[PDB]
């Protein structure tokens, strides 16, 4: 079994560029900037599929 | 299709007591299937009926 990828998901090549340090609520988060829209996401939760 | 009788080989059961506040982190997470449960003492159905 290989789980099928759900309809809403966007494919993203990994790159060192995608992740960075950033300030967010008084700590340095491992932010993931998201290439389709460019939104930064300091928290692991709440990120786009 | 038959119900098992010999004791079966169940996957290991990690208990995560969940407090009001806690630092979740997923370093060293298991990749194999593993049942996760919030409460301890979950063997509550003690009144056996003959």
């Amino acid at each position: 079994f290989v789980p099928d990828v759900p309809e809403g998901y966007v494919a993203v090549q990994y790159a060192h560029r995608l992740f960075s340090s950033s300030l967010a609520n008084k700590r340095n988060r491992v932010t993931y900037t998201h290439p389709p829209t460019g939104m930064a996401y300091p928290s692991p939760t709440g990120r786009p599929h | 299709d038959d119900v098992g009788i010999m004791q079966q080989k169940k996957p290991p059961t990690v208990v995560q007591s969940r407090t009001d506040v806690f630092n979740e982190q997923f370093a060293n997470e298991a990749l194999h299937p593993t049942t996760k449960v919030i409460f301890n003492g979950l063997d509550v159905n003690t009144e056996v009926q003959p």
Partner: protein
Amino acid sequence: EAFRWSRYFLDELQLRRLSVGLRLITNPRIARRFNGVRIMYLTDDDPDPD
């Protein structure tokens, strides 16, 4: 005349004080026993008790 209302068999000054006490008791600032709760699984990014 004193028999018309036992004043819960309390003295006059005790009543006069008692009213003020009712004012202390009904006060919002001392009303610090809290009722009810909300389980939800958010991150505590910016801790404010309120």
